[PDB]
Amino acid sequence: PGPEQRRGRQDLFDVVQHTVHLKPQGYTGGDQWLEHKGKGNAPGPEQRRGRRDLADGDAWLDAKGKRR
Amino acid sequence: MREVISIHIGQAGIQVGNACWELYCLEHGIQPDGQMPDAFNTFFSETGAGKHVPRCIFLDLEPTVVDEVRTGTYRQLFHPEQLISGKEDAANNFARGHYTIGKEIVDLALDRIRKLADNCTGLQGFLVFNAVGGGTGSGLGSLLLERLSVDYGKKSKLGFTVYPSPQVSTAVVEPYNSVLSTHSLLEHTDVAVMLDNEAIYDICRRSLDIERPTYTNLNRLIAQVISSLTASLRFDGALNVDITEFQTNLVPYPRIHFMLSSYAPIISAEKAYHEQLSVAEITNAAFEPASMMVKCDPRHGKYMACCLMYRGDVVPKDVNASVATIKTKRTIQFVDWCPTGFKCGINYQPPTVVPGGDLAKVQRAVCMISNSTAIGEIFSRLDHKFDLMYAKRAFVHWYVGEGMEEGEFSEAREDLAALEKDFEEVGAE
Amino acid sequence: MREVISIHIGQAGIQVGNACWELYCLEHGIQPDGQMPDAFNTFFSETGAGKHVPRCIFLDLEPTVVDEVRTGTYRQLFHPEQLISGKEDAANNFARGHYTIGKEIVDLALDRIRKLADNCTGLQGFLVFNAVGGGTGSGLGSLLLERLSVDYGKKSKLGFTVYPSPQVSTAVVEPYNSVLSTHSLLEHTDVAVMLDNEAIYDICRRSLDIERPTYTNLNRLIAQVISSLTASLRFDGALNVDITEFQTNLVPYPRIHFMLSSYAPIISAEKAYHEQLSVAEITNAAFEPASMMVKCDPRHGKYMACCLMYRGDVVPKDVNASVATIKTKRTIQFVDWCPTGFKCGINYQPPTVVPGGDLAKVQRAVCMISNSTAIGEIFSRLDHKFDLMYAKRAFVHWYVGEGMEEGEFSEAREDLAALEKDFEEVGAES
Amino acid sequence: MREIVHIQGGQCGNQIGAKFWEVVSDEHGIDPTGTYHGDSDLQLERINVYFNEATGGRYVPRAILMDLEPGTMDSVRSGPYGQIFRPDNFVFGQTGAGNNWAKGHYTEGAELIDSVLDVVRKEAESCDCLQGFQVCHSLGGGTGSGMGTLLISKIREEYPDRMMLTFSVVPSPKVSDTVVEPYNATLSVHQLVENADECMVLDNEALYDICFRTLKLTTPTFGDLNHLISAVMSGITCCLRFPGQLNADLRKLAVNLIPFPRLHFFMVGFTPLTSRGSQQYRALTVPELTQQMWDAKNMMCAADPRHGRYLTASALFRGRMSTKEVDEQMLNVQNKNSSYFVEWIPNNVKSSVCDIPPKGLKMSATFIGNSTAIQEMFKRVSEQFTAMFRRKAFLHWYTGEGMDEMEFTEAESNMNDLVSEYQQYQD
Amino acid sequence: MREIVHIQGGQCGNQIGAKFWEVVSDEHGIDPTGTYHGDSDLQLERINVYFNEATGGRYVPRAILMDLEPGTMDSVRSGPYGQIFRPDNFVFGQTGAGNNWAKGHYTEGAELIDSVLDVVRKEAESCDCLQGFQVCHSLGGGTGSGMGTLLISKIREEYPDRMMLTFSVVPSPKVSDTVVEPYNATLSVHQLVENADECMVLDNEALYDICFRTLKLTTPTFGDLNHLISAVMSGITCCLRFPGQLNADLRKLAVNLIPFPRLHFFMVGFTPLTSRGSQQYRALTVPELTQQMWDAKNMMCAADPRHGRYLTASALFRGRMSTKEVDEQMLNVQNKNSSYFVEWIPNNVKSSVCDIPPKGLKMSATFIGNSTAIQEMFKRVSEQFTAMFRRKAFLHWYTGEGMDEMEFTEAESNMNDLVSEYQQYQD
Ligand SMILES: Nc1nc2c(ncn2[C@@H]2O[C@H](COP(=O)(O)OP(=O)(O)OP(=O)(O)O)[C@@H](O)[C@H]2O)c(=O)[nH]1
Ligand SMILES: Nc1nc2c(ncn2[C@@H]2O[C@H](COP(=O)(O)OP(=O)(O)OP(=O)(O)O)[C@@H](O)[C@H]2O)c(=O)[nH]1
Ligand SMILES: Nc1nc2c(ncn2[C@@H]2O[C@H](COP(=O)(O)OP(=O)(O)O)[C@@H](O)[C@H]2O)c(=O)[nH]1
Ligand SMILES: Nc1nc2c(ncn2[C@@H]2O[C@H](COP(=O)(O)OP(=O)(O)O)[C@@H](O)[C@H]2O)c(=O)[nH]1
Ligand SMILES: [Mg+2]
Questions:
Q1: Which of E223, E277, E279 is the closest to A18 by Cβ?
Q2: Which residues have a Cβ under 8 Å from the Cβ of D19 and sit 6 or more positions away?
């Protein structure tokens, strides 16, 4: 057997017949768009935050003073 | 896909690179045997199945520094033929590392640089590591940087050079090698980064309270700055600042490209709990005169341009706020023709810590690489020492014995004198 | 059925032949006794009840190389009659292997070949192994090739021959025997593949990092070329290149039939894991002068017809990409009148590795057999050696006394000079 | 049934436009995959304005994401609402602009501009006929400035009667995010005064203090700053995507806001900005939307509108409101503030009421301000460019790819002629 | 009742034809064992076009595998769908063609051509009506290029009223798989310009670009390429095998696509090809198929159609499509770029529709193009042949099997005659 059975995609019938939604999710095969990953990831300043105050820890509510 | 190919020349370059590649394997989780237990593509190549190799070459004419890597804990990491050795060292002779003993190794060196560039898709820059006070760092570095220009055109080259210290020195022909090496790296290096031993050892004495520091402690904090320089390629953030940014945002003229460096959080483990590390605090601490890598004084000159690279949990609000406060301080003064003084950049991940290292785990970081008019102070002092050295031809028969002509000494003297008149003229109002 | 016969003449042919039949036995699963615990028909004849015997004869006037085979660990593989011996060696005398002693053994030699040529259903060619420097290789090689062309016409003679190094050679009379063998090898064999001893020494020293190599390290990667040559007859592939396809796709003219060889992945065990072996990576290394198996610089001449035999996990597109990048490299130069210059053959079987061999397993491999005008440098350098000793008639009295006449050195020099003149004009830009 | 093609450029454009398609997707009921999940039928009549119908009910946006450094598009691809865009629309470079305008305009923008025009032209006849083109970029940059402006010049060359709506981030007055901001901004404006139709000038340092003072946000970030710009770009096309009592498309605002062809730079404000703790205290009424609208603090341009007179104003109100409450509150601001308005144009303020407010808002409005007070921002950019060009600082990179020093003088003249023309109409 | 006889020659054609019966038997519902297992009734009216009834419900293809090497016999036989062919139709040689055109045509083909004309006459006498002889081979080899063209001249002389469908790949521009392509191709085209009724020009490198730029497959094997070639051949006889709204057999294509008896070489494309990442986003409609139809990168020939004018094109639409929506898209491409079309042939394009699409894909089309842009392909072989022939390289072989150099001058003369009449009609 050739390298095709090692790669995993067998016969290109899925791509020709356009029935790729029947496949299990995550099947990259030999698709350059699917096998693209890079630049890493990092949360940074998005922790415990989201922009919701326009649509109705932050703000002047987090202002503190002297014990009563 | 982003790729940077680092080259380490000389003993100073290799030992820093030993600390540099230790930090790179810790960031991405690479085990020392070479296998992880997508972000690594700027420094490592996924070799076959479950093995990564560094994209670097350790070349030195002295075999003693190279085989310490080949016998150390990272013998299985580096490719066995990427590491380059030699029979005899240049031994503090710039003519030896350039003309008679460096020529036999530079043909094999570019054969690996050719194959490393063919392995990479899009090359982003070169990292060059040396100290100009030696033989291999100056001589073979001059051969490598010049020959990389004619082969790899218009590609950025970050030159991390360690210049001779003003007050202390480890060698006698250091003023000779520094003037000759600066003649080569002025015309060829795209961006040059200045390092000095005394200012780094002054950093360790004040902030890190290590009264007895060594090269191992010195090389780690240099490695932390360089990892912050390329942290934008490694990891995503708000304002990514890649390699071509420092080329055009710090170098106004094709001669003024010798920049300083500063890392704002340099705090030990027990000091870090009692220290509140705020962006307003560290940006003030980044521009402090005790915190540069080079023993030159900030307020003696004026800053041309400054680059604040930020790492970790930094919002874009307070970098906007603190830079304005930095501009309002009358202690520091900029040049009159550059009202837009800064360039900012924030990455979203904190720096890693070497286990057993002196640096503490800090949530924030600054890489303050700035262009100043005060670079002429460290150049004139090297210009003056070489002028007194060359007054009656001390240590010249060694250099002219190994092929170099006597006229090359005076030509390098004119080049630094041309550089000396550049900084006074440009910084003048 | 496809089927080839290998005649191994002289010690170099036998000692390489001791390594090639060690390779095919491990590849096809045949044990040293000759019994497997369909593809074997290219090299083995299935005998009776589950035994495979090689389709090779071992002939040499010196028995002391042949009796190592008879008493070795492969004593039950070969037919006893196929290992042909003689009383005394030709002993570095071309006149003794072609005229004096070789005439007695060549009559027996064609008898066992006629047995093997009658056992075939379709014969595709012959695989001659010899060294032109020795008396048996030059003498008995010329006599066996002379009788094979008359008996079996228009059949391909794939003669893998070993030539002396320009600098590091072992026998004094090697320049004399090489010229006299070339006078017969030029007009008889169909494809002749030069192997050089010193070029393989540089391959083992640099790529295989062995400081002290011997002959059994040399013959293993020579056998890797032969297995990569005939892998398209035994195993299937995307682009099958038969042995009969080589001579119609490599020799432009009837006289220019000399080709080089190069095996691209040659790495040790500890080198292989750190090296990202890619198809573009090995293809670039195959055209390098370091990986050439003849001591010559291919930048001096121009490549004329090159065939690549990709073994292993190679798709037909990374050979499409790598060949295009090779053609655009400025160091590699083709002749002007042959714009198509490449033959791409892919076989799906990865190369086998012998335990104790210095090659580790590699998923992909390239064997390039290249016709070049730079071979004129390999034949002018031996033309210079033949001129100096014949300028005052050195060593002639050994050849003259043993049957050969004085005059035959003259046209052998003229025939080699006619070959060098033909090599310059075919490389001439028009 | 009117269609807009969106093009995003560089780190600033891609990250802003990622938040732009964030807001309009959940405003139209689009999930991250692309299916419809809205609870009303009003969303689905106007979907072809920003989306293309695909098989299985998928909706791919009419977005072409383009840049020169490939790391930016990995950020939008990894983010939420990052799986909607067509992969053929994912056009990219590899080297990166490096914040050099001429490098992003001559060397590496040349090979990429052929690719992005093949994608855009294929998206052009994919619809019936374009309402216009919308782009987002930053004028101080090198990827969105040098390559974006050449994209604008070529797209006007082939599509001359089609519209342009550039949402451009101008450099800071106080700080510098890149040292070559005045070089990039002056060259970008020199292109944008001809080829662009409407330039919505937005500045970061007016976004920041809105977050800090009006919105009281202790930790503003680019996720918060882009969402203010994203709320604008939904508000400009509110009448395009929804029925309204008084409608206004791009051409409706084009003929009103532009008195003279060279004057097309606008300062923009988004009206209902209130911190979380002050939500219950503020009453949402048409008079106080207007009062928050006309404040100088609310503008997202660093130019102070008190120093210049408003040539033309346009306010795009959205929600269930009466058409005189929007009206006499525009009569009040022209009467109570007559010095800040232009005497040679009566009734400067242009109104528009849309029936569909955004998500979670009972009432909302977006302000477009064409005032002569924006000249001091352009004069400030002109002042820094004069300081650098006389000593030719940071300039050999721009001439490394053949853009001569003549073009800088041409850029300064077109900047100085433009800042004088604003002053000429101020008198 | 319009039967087609398939004959496969050479290593290339047999491997291509192995993938052809892989796809057609999948389309008609025949499993590898030969029995019928389909779910539709529309597959059961016309099986006779490509298959013969056998005793016990077995379906055997109308295939004749002919070769000079037993190597490619074993490759077809060992793969899937390999047992379907008759054991008697596996005619093969033993010596091998050796990539020698003269050995295929004169020496070794002579002992086999009588054996294969026994098989071809046997299959032709069995079927009721011959509609053509479909031969799939190569032009750069020797087994299918040399011996195959001998079979072209032999069938054409006892069967002069039947079409010939010579599916032949050509040498590629970027690389070269043998070294005697200009010698092999120029002699094979010399036989094809008279005896062959029409030819289909294919090449490897245009399939590689389709597999990479359009389908985004990183590792295309020959099975991926041959499936693209097999998708062509099912589309040629789409109207024969299945009922259609507007039928078009092989002669109707021949009478339209061939204006002059020497211009019968075509460039062919298969339209609906999208990457796996772009299946869910591409909305396949009749305008979308037409936009991919005339794109230069969808052609499976190396000739760029922008260089030459289209003498005659034909559209083989398969599926449930609106008839004018098919046609007005072809009318749109006739007028939006009319300089690319021949002026003296009005109404260049032909549209034919079949209401039975290929499996899984509801809309599909096959493009057949008789463009004069293919003169560059034959120009390349002509300039490659003239370079070798003046130096007489690789010629001592071909003169050895009785093929003198007088014939090779005639090949170049007929090669130049083909490109002369193509260049004659560009003006
Ligand atoms: N940054 C850094 N500098 C070092 C280190 N070790 C030595 N140096 C500096 O290197 C200088 C010596 O010059 P080099 O070019 O490194 O000498 P070399 O590399 O051994 O060159 P050769 O002697 O010719 O082999 C000394 O003055 C030190 O200041 C180190 O670990 N880190
Ligand atoms: N590659 C390789 N070359 C060999 C080997 N053995 C001998 N040679 C070459 O053969 C040359 C000697 O010529 P041969 O033909 O082998 O001599 P011979 O076979 O003993 O012939 P006679 O002396 O007449 O018996 C040497 O110069 C070697 O270069 C071997 O094992 N491997
Ligand atoms: N509001 C906002 N502004 C941004 C963002 N990213 C960058 N910018 C602005 O863009 C300007 C510089 O953009 P730059 O990265 O140089 O653009 P480019 O390199 O040409 O693509 C800075 O002044 C930033 O304020 C963002 O996510 N949001
Ligand atoms: N499309 C396709 N082409 C092939 C295949 N195998 C070989 N070829 C082509 O065939 C040509 C070589 O000719 P060859 O197979 O030797 O022809 P033959 O001598 O008649 O058998 C090359 O140009 C290949 O591109 C295949 O499986 N698919
Ligand atoms: Mg012997």
A1: E279
A2: D223, D226, D227, D229, D230
